[PDB]
Structures are given as structure tokens and as C-alpha cells.
Design a protein around this motif. Sequence first.
Motif, PDB file in Angstrom:
ATOM      1  N   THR A 163     -12.106  32.588  28.482  1.00  0.00           N
ATOM      2  CA  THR A 163     -11.092  31.578  28.776  1.00  0.00           C
ATOM      3  C   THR A 163      -9.820  32.248  29.290  1.00  0.00           C
ATOM      4  O   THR A 163      -9.160  31.747  30.191  1.00  0.00           O
ATOM      5  CB  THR A 163     -10.744  30.739  27.515  1.00  0.00           C
ATOM      6  N   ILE A 166      -7.833  32.854  33.012  1.00  0.00           N
ATOM      7  CA  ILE A 166      -6.860  31.932  33.591  1.00  0.00           C
ATOM      8  C   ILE A 166      -5.450  32.509  33.488  1.00  0.00           C
ATOM      9  O   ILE A 166      -4.604  32.241  34.333  1.00  0.00           O
ATOM     10  CB  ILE A 166      -6.901  30.530  32.909  1.00  0.00           C
ATOM     11  N   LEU A 198     -13.335  30.479  37.538  1.00  0.00           N
ATOM     12  CA  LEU A 198     -12.413  29.488  36.997  1.00  0.00           C
ATOM     13  C   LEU A 198     -12.642  28.084  37.567  1.00  0.00           C
ATOM     14  O   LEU A 198     -12.305  27.087  36.929  1.00  0.00           O
ATOM     15  CB  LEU A 198     -10.965  29.941  37.193  1.00  0.00           C
ATOM     16  N   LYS A 202      -9.105  24.198  38.106  1.00  0.00           N
ATOM     17  CA  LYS A 202      -8.138  24.980  37.345  1.00  0.00           C
ATOM     18  C   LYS A 202      -7.197  25.736  38.286  1.00  0.00           C
ATOM     19  O   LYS A 202      -6.000  25.863  38.014  1.00  0.00           O
ATOM     20  CB  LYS A 202      -8.841  25.974  36.409  1.00  0.00           C
ATOM     21  N   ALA A 206      -3.130  24.948  38.620  1.00  0.00           N
ATOM     22  CA  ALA A 206      -2.235  26.066  38.329  1.00  0.00           C
ATOM     23  C   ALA A 206      -1.176  26.308  39.416  1.00  0.00           C
ATOM     24  O   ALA A 206      -0.191  27.005  39.171  1.00  0.00           O
ATOM     25  CB  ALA A 206      -3.042  27.335  38.078  1.00  0.00           C
TER      26      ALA A 206
END
Length: 229
Positions: A163, A166, A198, A202, A206
Motif C-alpha cells: 500500500t 502510493i 497503483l 489513485k 493524487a
Amino acid sequence: LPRTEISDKITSELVSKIGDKNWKIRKEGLDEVAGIINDAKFIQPNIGELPTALKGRLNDSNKILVQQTLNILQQLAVAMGPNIKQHVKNLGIPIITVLGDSKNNVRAAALATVNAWAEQTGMKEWLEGEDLSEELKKENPFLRQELLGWLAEKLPTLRSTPTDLILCVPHLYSCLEDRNGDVRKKAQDALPFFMMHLGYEKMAKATGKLKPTSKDQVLAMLEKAKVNM
């Protein structure tokens, strides 16, 4: 054949000698350590205060001691095996910082050390936690270049990204607008390989934490990325 505990060889005498103010004396400490490991051939994952000692010489004022320290970190990786994943956060991450050195041959040696560790640890331990992102965040164009170029190389050899990957993206986005062109170029090269893991959703989201102008153009080449995964 067998694995020795060498932490009984990492004397308090030895530690302090590594940290001496005379470089020739510091070199003596490193020579012994190099010999201790070589004479051991294979070691246990416990090395006493040696990590603390080596951490300091990674930023030595004499660049041939940075280099001997890297060679010792390389031989540590081989002598210890995968167990060295234990020293990644406290010792391995300081190697990454050495990528910010202005001399190519020093940067090259750092990279070769990090790669030598990656062989025994695999990439997951490096990507876990904010530690790497923290390094990439630093406004050093040598360190950004090498790190991004490192991730471009290592990421396509991964099917279990944590995770925490990111976490690099905000800084990855800085680099696409870095002062330095080489940095902008390696940030571009790492774009596909980040998305592969990712996902586009995402990534694009971002960009929302960016200024309107940056968010604008980032999404543009983020869309050129959707050409490949």
C-alpha cells in the motif's frame, strides 16, 4: 559452511576507532571489519553496534572511506543473506542517501550496494513505510535521478507492491517539474511502472493535491501513460 556471530568481534575499541578524527585511523577500523566478515564467510544477522558505526562513514569526509564502507555493505549482504532485510530501515536507507553524492563514481557505488542488498531482501522491504518516499522528497537532483531510475528498473519485477508505494507519488509529481532535466526525465520514465501497480484512479486523484497548473499538465502525460498499462 557455518554462520558465526561476529558481534563479539565488534568491540567498543573498534567502534570508536571507526569514528576517530583521523581518517587513517578510521580506515583501520573498516579494514578490520572487512577482514572479520571475509574470515567469517557467512554470518548471523546480529552485528552489534556496527550498523551505527557504518552509518556514520556513509557520510565520511574522505570519499575513499564512503567507498570502502559501501564495499563492506556489499560484502555484508552476501555474508548475511536475506536476514539482512533486518538492517534495511536503519542501515540500508542511509545507503540510498549516498545516491545524492555529486560524484558519479560514488553514486554508482551506492546504487551497486543497494542492488546487492535487493538481491537478498527483494524489493518489498524497501518500498514499505514512508522511509523511501522521505528520501525521494529531498530536493537533491542527484538523489532523485538515481532513485527514480532505480524504481523504473525494479518495479517491473514486482507482483506484490505494498500500500505504501502510493507514498512516493506526491514527490514523484514534484520531480516531473524538477529544476533538473535529468530528474524530469527519470520521473517520466517511472510513470508507467507506478501506474501498473497503483492504477490510474489513485494516480489521477493524487494530482488533486497539486496546484491547478501542475495538476493540469501532470494529468496530460499521466494520460500518455495509459498507452501502456
